[PDB]
Ligand binder design. Sequence first.
Ligand code: B12
Ligand code: SF4
Ligand code: SF4
Ligand code: NI
Ligand code: NI
Lengths: 442, 424, 313, 126
Amino acid sequence: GLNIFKLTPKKNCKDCGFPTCLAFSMKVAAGAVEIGKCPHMSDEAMEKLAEATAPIMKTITIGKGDNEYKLGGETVLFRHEKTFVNRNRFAVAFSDSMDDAEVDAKIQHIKDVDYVRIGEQMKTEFAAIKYAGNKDKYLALINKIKASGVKVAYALVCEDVAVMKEALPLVKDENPLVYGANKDNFKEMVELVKGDKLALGVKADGLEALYGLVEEIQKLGYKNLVLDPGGKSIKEAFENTVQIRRINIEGQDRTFGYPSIIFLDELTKADKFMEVALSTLFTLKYGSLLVLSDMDYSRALPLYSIRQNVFTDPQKPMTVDLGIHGINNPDENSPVLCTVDFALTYFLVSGEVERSKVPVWMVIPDAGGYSVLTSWAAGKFTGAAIADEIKKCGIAEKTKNRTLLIPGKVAVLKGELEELLPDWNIVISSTEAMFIPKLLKE
Amino acid sequence: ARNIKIKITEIPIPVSFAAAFEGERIRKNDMLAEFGGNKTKAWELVMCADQGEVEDHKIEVIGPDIDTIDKAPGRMPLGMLIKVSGTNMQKDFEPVLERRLHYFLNYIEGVMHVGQRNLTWVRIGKEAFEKGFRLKHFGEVIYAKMLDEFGSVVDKCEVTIITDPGKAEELEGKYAVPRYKERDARLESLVDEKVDTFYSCNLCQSFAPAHVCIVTPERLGLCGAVSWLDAKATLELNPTGPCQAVPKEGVVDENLGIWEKVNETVSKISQGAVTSVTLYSILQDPMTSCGCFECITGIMPEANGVVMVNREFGATTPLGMTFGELASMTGGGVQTPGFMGHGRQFIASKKFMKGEGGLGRIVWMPKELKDFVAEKLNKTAKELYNIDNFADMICDETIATESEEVVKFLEEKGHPALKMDPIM
Amino acid sequence: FKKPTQKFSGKIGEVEIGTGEKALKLGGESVLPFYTFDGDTGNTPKVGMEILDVYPEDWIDPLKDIYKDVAKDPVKWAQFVEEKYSPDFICLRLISADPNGTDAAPEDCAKTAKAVVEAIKTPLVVAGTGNHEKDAKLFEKVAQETEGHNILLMSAVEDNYKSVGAAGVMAYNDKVVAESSVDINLAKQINILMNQLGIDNTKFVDNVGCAAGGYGYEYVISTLDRVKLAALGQDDKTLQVPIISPVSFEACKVKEAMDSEEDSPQWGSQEDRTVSMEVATASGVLASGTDAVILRHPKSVEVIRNFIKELLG
Amino acid sequence: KEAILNFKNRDQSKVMIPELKCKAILGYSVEEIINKLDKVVNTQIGPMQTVKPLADVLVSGVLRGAAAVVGCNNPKVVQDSAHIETIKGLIKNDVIVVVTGCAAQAAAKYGLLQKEAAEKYAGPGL
Ligand code: B12
Ligand code: SF4
Ligand code: SF4
Ligand code: NI
Ligand code: NI
């Protein structure tokens, strides 16, 4: 970033929303903001820094405000090297040849599978509507999905340009993914898709053919592309995906710098457990949009949890909100518990309390996102912090029940907590969360 | 003759001994005995001695014991002289072992001891007295824990507890204060050129996969809790631990702090993520930072200098970023030229930014941090030949925070950084 | 464009578990998992089945229905598992030695392990409890009784690495698992301690920690990635040992798998959720660099074996 | 100060310093030797601060004897040749060698005043 700082006007005019040119240079160095934000940049420096700063992998935005999803923007091959930026999305595959009962069942499955895990809403993102040969039934299917009310983004999978020219205006205003560009129709697809700046799906036979097709499409002047790795088998598809990502990153080649779409329903032949295995594989192996034959809770529970874990920033652990977290509606005569702001620890303790089916007032002090032991070591989950959080949160609503449960890891805090909370009854609990229910039954 | 050591199964004390007993607060009216603090003179000392001078497992109590107390409180001097003998025992290991005393005593329920050296006070409740606790059990516990924890560096341990008013002060003057003064003198007089090996710590690689800390006498571990002597003690006590010796061989640049052996060690420890480092520079292959650093130093080009910010500072900085943004940009084990994460003891070091003219480039610093650092900073800048109070040339957040105002202040005050060569 | 030619100087060592025609080999690869387009993958990752030395009372209803007439006798349970499902190996977990639970003497568990190891031909993995002090004595007696079968002993942590290493590799010619808690540096430290003790890389495997999907899973994934990159890319000799992951130990214990359909009607079939959790955790750890996975449900073993065959074949 | 001021008269074009230096360890007074011998004294036996360990190794025959190598150089002998050959022969025969003066300096230049020299030149007992 200091390098781009040399090219900056150094006026510190605050016209870009950043107080100093160094701040702007560091913001564009991280890739958060493009360089076009500076009005006073010299033209030549702009023309050079456009190429110098351009990300090695392009981010593609699909969907409207509620269903907006970004795919791409990756910089490393392993999450420990640097965070993984944009998480993969899931599509449910509807087909023209499918009967009404199956379509209704899949619509209901998409609608029902929707929950929240640690503040994030897990639900199906995309509806991949494929063309099987009947244009009228395909239009009827896409209209039916649009009329059902499911909150999903649209991905039209149609090889025929003639059918797509009629299918696109039905969902054109929703910013869909247009798929079906080949070596013999990419000319007819770019002109159809470049007007509204919609994402264009590119497919071919093999990495070399795909590379040539993408080169031709880029020569046409279109960069809002989503690549489809080929492969007649699971092994070939895995090889193609891995090689596309490694060429983009290790090779520093921007021809393959686009998110990949993988049709897992076709590779797995509609096998639920094989779909789960391949989805877990491609969550870690550069698959950006995974298409599945169906979506239920058996699929969603592992896949969404693993996706939430993997695409967590290594330097920014997930945290829960602070203050009072009422569990099991714990009004009047309920034990008070305290734990650490860590998302994982809070999830574990909340699940254990829910299993016990007993009211509990849980108070979450500020801890820096560290765990029980390492937050005390850092100096956040101290007795003073717990006492201050108890004083300020508003736990004084209760009158009689005054037991305050403390993690067994921090046993030193008992004296300090009793000193700072003479009224409260500090009770050191066990060392593990499995214990929570049996000690609370006591 | 066979170097055979027999380990003690349990501590011979009536009072139960467990690690969960730390931090217990025990009532004032139950305080049978209280030594140290503003009331009495108490001290502790762990000193290396030759095998002849210390006899193994000899607990000597001199003066009245706690039994003689017949009033609700107790008030008598307490002096704990611990002599340790061993083949690998060194004076530099004395400050480490002594620290563990704080912990070794706190694991005993009924007694609470806190403090450093002669600043320690110990409070013993009457429940331990009823159980049968005496002053000899202090020696029993200290001997057992010294032979447990430091059994690889300590062969014999002798603990003497002194309660007489005369012998407690006589032994403190003869033994305690000279040890403290020589320890402080060694801490202050150690420089990079005097030593022949640095140390490398990778304890923060659990969250910063590429970070390697290079600890030198004049460059502290940026967590602030690891020093050169601490690294040496950790390497001796835990050879397979995070602190490993780095020979200072194959010098390339003495001013910028470039060594071929240091580069090789950093490359190996970081698993090849970091290739070349410079110890004394922030613009040429700087050292990485993890995220435990107390202070962040960032280059200010318009001032031709550097600004600093601690984690307790929440307002903006002349760089235009807060501490959170600087920490996000700097930490994570990534080499970011122009930004550095470091501790509070590294500011007033003669190796601080030695590759860019030294610490004379510090132009902005928070007011509380400036007040904390001023004495040592002024000493080092006087080594630079600057004025008696160099910290006055350093701008504060109250004086000026906008970059233009900071430069105006520097021009008014004649800050030396404005008269140096360009920083980058 | 240039094909990505990722050449690694390092190579994972091979460790052999079991005796006879059923003995398996772990490790031997010089590329990332399933990277058949980059070079040589040494041995196919192995899938083992978990059984208990006592009746499984906390297991889900379908699992107890599968082993209704064999779970009471560990010998019969192991024979049934080897006959009907024929896994790569069987992990006998000595739950009865848990000090928290119905604590049992090491002699009883050693006798059970000896009875089991003389009835099956597949390699056996004997896993202890979470208590290090109990584990040391238990593995002493287990390795003494099960001599001559080249079993694998799990959870040789730094606290008791000397005891399990001596009673295992050194005395009775067994293999051991050096376990470290989700840290590359801790894995290096335990490997270096084992090497300094007198145990080379051909005589133990590594356990860098395991976790269910969504419960500290990214730490396991990052540890596996870092260990694999250091062992292969950086040619780090202290990490060139195969990795074994017990997946069913944590995957089947989570709420997403344990809860029945009565507790969470919207979630659906309990068996499907259990199998899905096992499959997801196993697939992730296999893709990140593990060499053997322990599973519980037979359907999970079938799915994971098919997954491995599809990726490698 | 006279020596320092003469540095201005240095002619660097006439300077040739061979890059040949050798590490040496010295300082073995009788007191230092006794302090070193204290390491091999069993504490439960003693006594400390005596030459008794040296007397023991000499009496037992682990060391055959002790030899002092002293004296100057002489143009009649190839310089340092006799010192080095005598010292190497003696230590190879498990005779511990004490050196003084120009002989000691010949040993220092050659590299015999090193701990490593024990495994390079000495016999088994020494
Ligand atoms: C993971 C980890 C890290 C990760 C944490 C990841 C994260 N995002 O939180 C990171 C790398 C950040 C970390 C850092 C450090 N760590 Co650390 N860390 C650990 C580790 C491996 C486990 C902690 C953990 O994740 N636990 C799981 C979480 C989900 O559970 P938990 O919060 O511990 O709570 C458990 C119970 O208490 C219970 N529970 C919680 N609340 C309640 C309430 C009640 C009523 C009940 C009944 C139960 C209960 O629930 C959990 C069980 O399910 C331990 C190893 C060990 N031996 O414990 C070391 C360890 C705790 N770390 C340690 C240290 C010292 C540090 C550092 C200070 C130095 C270092 N590098 O080692 C740094 C931090 C530097 C700083 N000051 O900024 C030490 C702690 C020693 C001490 N002083 O106590 C350990 C033991 C390692 C070591 N030996 O050096 N660490
Ligand atoms: S608009 Fe450009 S010159 Fe003005 S403050 Fe922002 S980065 Fe600096
Ligand atoms: S910051 Fe401290 S603990 Fe972390 S690696 Fe550096 S010296 Fe070690
Ligand atoms: Ni650190
Ligand atoms: Ni840090």
